[PDB]
Symmetry: C3
């Protein structure tokens, strides 16, 4: 019965290497894990000029296309918009999307149950020469978004510069880290663009590069909106120096079927007073949605997790020996 | 004895079924699990007309009551508000809740330590015919919010239509899903409203229906504000087809004591220039805020989790056999 | 030997006391834990007057320095700003930090690849008496933010009052709780300031106190920006009365190296129409970023977790007895 003893010793050494190698080195059992508190700050530096027929050139800056101007992890960068200027409340025709009337008797006074555009007065007024729509009480210039410009108005926003400022701190270990690692210098930040292989630590991200890394064409998203997911990973080992701690950036493309509700869009208004009359400008903005999520874990050596892992390894070794003895007994 | 062997085989088959079933089949240990990256897009439709005393009708559209116009998981829908128009900086009387003075000597120049309304000039001026308040420097049309209208101004927002666009993707499995499931055909959305049993996949949610599902009456919340929590679950099995992956919507009502701090409210201003003077309109908006949280888990068959579960089951079987033998030995 | 036997009995009773005490009493294994749904509401009460050279006093109320006026867990409180008023689109000189030209031939028509400030017409115009900059198309009053005032403009915002309204609910146990505990009352809320020892339940947080508890001086964070992280813990036991459930507030300071990108800052603009011409006021706001994160769990007695913990304890006791017997055999 020497071969059975050799098999027993082989199982013994295998489970020993498993409990000493996988639990300690691979899983970092002797270390302890703690969460972090993260705050994301984003700033854009880009300018795009859009010229519309019958209107002067429009200058767009960081305050314009960044609607969360205060700064948030979730922000929208405007790429295409539909402008309905000089809106004023009054009795006027509605959009043909709500309904088409051939006579005043067909119109019913009240409010539409679904997709209401205003309060119908019960009269049928011609929206244009061909068709007629119900008269409603509201903003007289209706947003007609049936025509979307195929070339993106803010097409210059493809190669803009996006700077992400992320500060993370572990309360258990009392260590504060920032995306600006020691390998990040001022002269380096002056001229650098983020790359997956060349410049990973450069905190300046190109919007077109971010969109292309996610797997989406920038033009199709700029046409009618899009969603891009950015994730920052702070997995690091505090047994080494804090210089080794560096963030990892991953880009994920969030998209759906193109036939049903493609892209991301919303409507906002700028209220102003002109000539003593309250007016507003309505914009249907097709912009790319950027969501930043920060998840990180830090491991530092501690005696209690080490002792617990040693006890678990001893228990696993004992269970393995007992199972081998039972298999030998048959 | 025979009973000893019967009990032994019974425990054997019980632990075998346990390690091959609940542990393996029910808990789905043969599949790996990972998180998702989610982005929430919300769009509101519906119009409400509010006619104030001594003021013309005010038309409110999606851009108006939705203050997060860009689109976020946490958004506030206006249901009631208190409007103080034409606010200009100057020297004027303060609110009575801040302080009541009977003479100029009682007033003290400076700023209030708590609940400051303006820089006190140091003179006692009559707020109205009966009482007098300290003169302060700031917006002279001071907000008087002691009277809240019992009927909600934007009470038509009960049966509005809320569209939620959620795109989730699992980076581990590289599978992208959207709330617009294959059952959603685009024409179904034209005439569907979300229901717990009838229309679970309709992406259009009625605000009143959501408030009722949360366990609250819409009128009481619309009067003085409210908080409603919406959760979306994406638990699915990747071994089946992707069509089986469907989101589950749950509504939670977040409330508290009605006596102390009832509802939810905030204050914002719209700055404009009229007649060469900087003026603003102050609104105390009593509206219901909706917080959308997305959590999902996907499982797909993998060999390593299966092997680990098989090893754990074999270990548990061995431990159970040892314990049964020790118990039968007595 | 009897001594070996009593040693084995001592070891087994020790491990039994361990598995019965640590798992049940200390770790609360007999009860199950679930997550919560949290919504954070913040309200600021404070007024700061900033007087600029050549401009009248400016009143900044809650609606002014709270840019997320609708209310969110992540909000920025304005403490210092650089104001550039009366911005209009035109052909004027650019900022000298972008480029300096000595002749018209040096200028290149087009847009800058990095940090673009506008569309260069191609002519070199004098920015001031000494130096000349490239003429660009855009907002003529180019922002000159080289000089930052050392005293914070909104330095009065140090001892302002911040009220946090957090409502949490556990869907598994259907228990709803709010940060306003039964001990907190209206008279207490009228006059109280949060303290770690004196007033832990007071929901009114002083901004200066919050910044000092995080470990940062308020002056530098007000001058050049800062980030402060607030965490709310709702760890509670449902075996006791709901009165014992009270939130715990912790403040974490998120900072980085001062040499490279110190503090937090953003840029926003207010659009208005004056004299029939579209104009805007651009502000470079240096403010403290406040992030509120809520994480908590609740535990209530259940039979299935208790039975599972009892089974695990019996298994651990059996494994320990088997290992002790194997050691005694050696
Ligand atoms: N989106 C961006 N693209 C390119 N560079 C950026 C961007 N954001 C910041 N930077 C650079 O990082 C440096 C430090 O950033 P910081 O947060 O101090 O901005 P800032 O200096 O206040 O902005 P500005 O350069 O407009 O004054 C700046 O010199 C700036 O040039
Ligand atoms: N809140 C809502 N209530 C009801 N239907 C909605 C809502 N939001 C969107 N829809 C419908 O869903 C469809 C697809 O949504 P999508 O994001 O394409 O809107 P859209 O067509 O860009 O906006 P609009 O309908 O204003 O032109 C639209 O035809 C629209 O009618
Ligand atoms: N930032 C704050 N600082 C000090 N006290 C506050 C603050 N926010 C709210 N409170 C106090 O809490 C009480 C209840 O809060 P609530 O949300 O009802 O405010 P409110 O009464 O709507 O606002 P206001 O007091 O301005 O009318 C109020 O009486 C108010 O005095
Ligand atoms: C009038 O408006 C309708 C709206 O759908 C459009 O189909 C039609 O072509 C328009 N006619 C003219 C002459 O513009
Ligand atoms: C791409 O980047 C360059 C900068 O080198 C810029 O000039 C160009 O306009 C960008 N492309 C688009 C489509 O904006
Ligand atoms: C700063 O770090 C960057 C990293 O690539 C490096 O290229 C640059 O030379 C460094 N500058 C100094 C002054 O060390
Ligand atoms: C004057 O204002 C005070 C404020 O509380 C109010 O109680 C009182 O009724 C007012 N008097 C008149 C005549 O409006
Ligand atoms: C309920 O919905 C209907 C649409 O069918 C609408 O007409 C009605 O105004 C809604 N109720 C309220 C109180 O808004
Ligand atoms: C699309 O799916 C919906 C799901 O309810 C169904 O009612 C509708 O008939 C379907 N349309 C088509 C054209 O299949
Ligand atoms: C002109 O502007 C430049 C910008 O850097 C500055 O250095 C210089 O001192 C200015 N000269 C005068 C006279 O203001
Ligand atoms: C500190 O708080 C007091 C209120 O007691 C206030 O008067 C003072 O202005 C505050 N300090 C600063 C620097 O704002
Ligand atoms: C309000 O709460 C405080 C905090 O302990 C307490 O001292 C005070 O007695 C309470 N007042 C009332 C009326 O309950
Ligand atoms: Ca205006
Ligand atoms: Mg449309
Ligand atoms: Mg009040
Ligand atoms: Mg600068």
């Amino acid at each position: 019965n020497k071969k059975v003893g050799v098999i027993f010793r082989l199982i013994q050494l295998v489970v020993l290497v498993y409990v000493i190698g996988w639990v300690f080195v691979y899983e970092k059992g002797y270390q302890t894990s703690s969460g972090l508190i993260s705050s994301v700050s984003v700033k854009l530096k880009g300018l795009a000029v859009t010229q519309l027929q019958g209107l002067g050139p429009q200058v767009w800056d960081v305050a314009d296309y960044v609607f969360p101007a205060h700064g948030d992890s979730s922000f929208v960068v405007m790429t295409n918009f539909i402008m309905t200027p000089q809106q004023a409340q009054g009795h006027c025709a509605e959009n043909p999307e709500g309904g088409i009337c051939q006579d005043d008797s067909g119109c019913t006074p009240g409010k539409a149950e679904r997709k209401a555009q205003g309060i119908r007065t019960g009269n049928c007024v011609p929206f244009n020469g061909t068709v007629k729509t119900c008269e409603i009480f509201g903003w007289c210039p209706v947003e007609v978004d049936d025509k979307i410009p195929s070339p993106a108005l803010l097409h210059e926003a493809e190669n803009f510069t996006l700077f992400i400022k992320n500060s993370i701190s572990f309360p258990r270990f009392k260590v504060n880290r920032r995306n600006l690692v020691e390998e990040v210098n001022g002269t380096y930040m002056k001229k650098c663009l983020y790359h997956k292989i060349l410049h990973p630590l450069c905190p300046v991200f190109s919007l077109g590069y971010v969109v292309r890394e996610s797997g989406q064409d920038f033009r199709s998203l700029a046409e009618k909106g899009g969603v891009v997911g950015i994730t920052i990973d702070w997995e690091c080992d505090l047994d080494w120096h804090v210089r080794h701690c560096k963030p990892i950036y991953q880009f994920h493309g969030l998209y759906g079927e193109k036939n049903l509700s493609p892209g991301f869009n919303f409507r906002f208004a700028r209220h102003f007073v002109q000539n003593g009359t309250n007016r507003r400008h309505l914009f249907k903005v097709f912009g790319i949605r950027f969501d930043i999520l920060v998840d990180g874990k830090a491991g530092k050596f501690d005696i209690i997790p080490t002792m617990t892992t040693i006890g678990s390894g001893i228990g696993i070794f004992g269970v393995a020996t007992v199972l081998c003895d039972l298999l030998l007994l048959h």
